[PDB]
Ligand binder design. Structure first.
Ligand SMILES: CC[C@H](C)CN(C[C@@H](O)[C@H](Cc1ccccc1)NC(=O)O[C@H]1CO[C@H]2OCC[C@H]21)S(=O)(=O)c1ccc(CO)cc1
Lengths: 99, 99
C-alpha cells in the first residue's frame, strides 16, 4: 500500500505471538520494541537519539510480520516509548520513500 | 525520486542560504536540526525523543528546500544527534511510504 504522512505511520505487527502497533521509521537503522519477555539469548546494547541513550536487549533472527509482510532480523527490546520498525526490516518488506 | 532503505535516507537541504545534510525520518513528527544560526525570532520549546527531552529553539514559517523540493514550516534547532526531516515537512514535499 501507500501510506501518507499526515499522521504517524503506525501499522500492526506480529512478533513473538503478539500483535502490536509500530512506527514504520525510515530514521531508525534498527528495530526497537517496547519491553517484552522474548525467549532466547540476547546481547546488551545502548542506542541514542534525542534526549540521550537507552539500554536495550538485542535479539537476532526474530520473525516479525508487518502488514502481512514477513521479515526476520534483529530486534532491540527496551524502554522505548514507541514501537519502531527500522530500516533493517523495512528493506525486507520492500518499503520505499517516494516524492 | 524513489528511495530504497538499505542505506540511511540522507539528502541535501538548503536552509538560511546554507547547504546541509539531513535524514528523512518518517518516525519524527517534527524537524530538528543541529545547532546553527537562523534569522528571525524564535521561542524556547521542549521536544522528547527515545532518550528523553531536550530544549530547542522553535523557528516558524522557515523556508527550507529538501532534495530540490520547497517547504515552509517549523524548524526546531537544538542538540539532536543528527539533522532530521520530520513529517511536518515530509508532507509538504509530497513524501509517502510505499510497499
Ligand atoms: C538519530 C536519528 C533519529 C533521532 C533516530 N530515532 C528515530 C526517530 O524516528 C524517532 C523515533 C521516535 C518517535 C516517537 C518517540 C521516541 C522516538 N523520532 C524522533 O525522535 O522524533 C522527534 C522529533 O519529532 C518528534 O516526534 C516523535 C518524537 C519527536 S530514535 O528513536 O532515537 C532511534 C531508533 C533506532 C535506533 C537503533 O538503530 C537508534 C535511535
Amino acid at each position: 500500500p501507500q501510506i501518507t504522512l499526515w499522521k504517524r505511520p503506525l501499522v500492526t505487527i506480529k512478533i513473538g505471538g503478539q500483535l502490536k502497533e509500530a512506527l514504520l521509521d525510515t530514521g531508525a537503522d534498527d528495530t526497537v520494541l517496547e519491553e517484552m519477555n522474548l525467549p532466547g539469548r540476547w546481547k546488551p546494547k545502548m542506542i541514542g537519539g534525542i534526549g540521550g541513550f537507552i539500554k536495550v536487549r538485542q535479539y537476532d533472527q526474530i520473525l516479525i510480520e508487518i502488514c502481512g509482510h514477513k521479515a526476520i532480523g534483529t530486534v532491540l527490546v527496551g524502554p522505548t516509548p514507541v514501537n519502531i520498525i527500522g530500516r533493517n526490516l523495512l528493506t525486507q518488506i520492500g518499503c520505499t520513500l517516494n516524492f
